[PDB]
Automatic annotation (TrEMBL), chain A:
Involved in the regulation of growth and apoptosis. Mediates activation of stress-responsive MTK1/MEKK4 MAPKKK. SUPFAM superfamilies: L30e-like. GO terms for cellular component: nucleus. Undergoes concentration-dependent homodimerization, which is required for growth inhibititory activity and enhances interaction with PCNA. Interacts with GADD45GIP1. Interacts with PCNA. Residues 8-89 form the Ribosomal protein eL8/eL30/eS12/Gadd45 domain. It comes from Mus musculus (Mouse). GO terms for biological process: apoptotic process; cell differentiation; positive regulation of MAPK cascade; regulation of cell cycle. Belongs to the GADD45 family. PANTHER family: GROWTH ARREST AND DNA DAMAGE-INDUCIBLE PROTEIN GADD45 (PTHR10411), GROWTH ARREST AND DNA DAMAGE-INDUCIBLE PROTEIN GADD45 GAMMA (PTHR10411:SF4). InterPro entries: GADD45, Ribosomal_eL30-like_sf, Ribosomal_eL8/eL30/eS12/Gad45. This is Growth arrest and DNA damage-inducible protein GADD45 gamma.
Length: 128, 131
């Protein structure tokens, strides 16, 4: 795949935040997807190694992920939940909605490229 | 093994009363959020699904999470199978009743219904809404 996906995610998170385009949290995210999926352009699921044994969380993730995939919403995983919080400052789910965004374009391509080698929900490493 | 009678009538009154008081929450997504943010405020939950809804796996999994959470937090919870009748009274697949921070008579009766159900090891009993 392309390099710099983590950079583009960093950029997009900050841009979306300043534009009032972010929704955070599993419960609110699931609600927004149910109500108006058409305006959602990106989803980040974030889980650290420990989060893997939190069954209710992972099930929430599974439902959110299946919905994103069924509705052609770009979605990625982030394992550095600390670094994600440090950027936007749980935070287990973040949706980005539409308010020209090169960072979103690059991420869209990254997801497209991932799909080309059958990696439907790719991991992104956040930059320091 | 016959139940306390009048649970359906009590639920009918509780739904109307809660709506009138502005302390009813409706919908799976909104209910999950409300439950999660302050379970202490929630006094009753109704999970509603017709026979065809039993094959709606996403819905049933949401129900499983809401139910587990209610049980874990000692929130009285019941199942209702007639979504059309529930709709005539009040996404109505989940309803919460919260405290308008009331001791409504119907809530007390339903709390006793859930207590009797637990003494029969029926953790999440069914209520039939009357016509």
């Amino acid at each position: 795949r392309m390099q710099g996906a983590g950079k583009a995610l960093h950029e997009l998170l900050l841009s979306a935040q300043r534009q009032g385009c972010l929704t955070a949290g599993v419960y609110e995210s699931a609600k927004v997807l149910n109500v108006d999926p058409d305006n959602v352009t990106f989803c980040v699921l974030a889980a650290d190694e420990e989060d893997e044994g939190d069954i209710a969380l992972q099930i929430h993730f599974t439902l959110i992920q299946a919905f994103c995939c069924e509705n052609d919403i770009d979605i990625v995983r982030v394992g550095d939940v600390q670094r994600l919080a440090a950027i936007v400052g749980d935070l287990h789910c973040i949706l980005i909605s539409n308010p020209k965004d090169p960072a979103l374009e690059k991420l869209s391509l990254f997801c497209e490229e991932s799909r080309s080698f059958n990696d439907w929900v790719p991991s992104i490493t956040l930059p320091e």
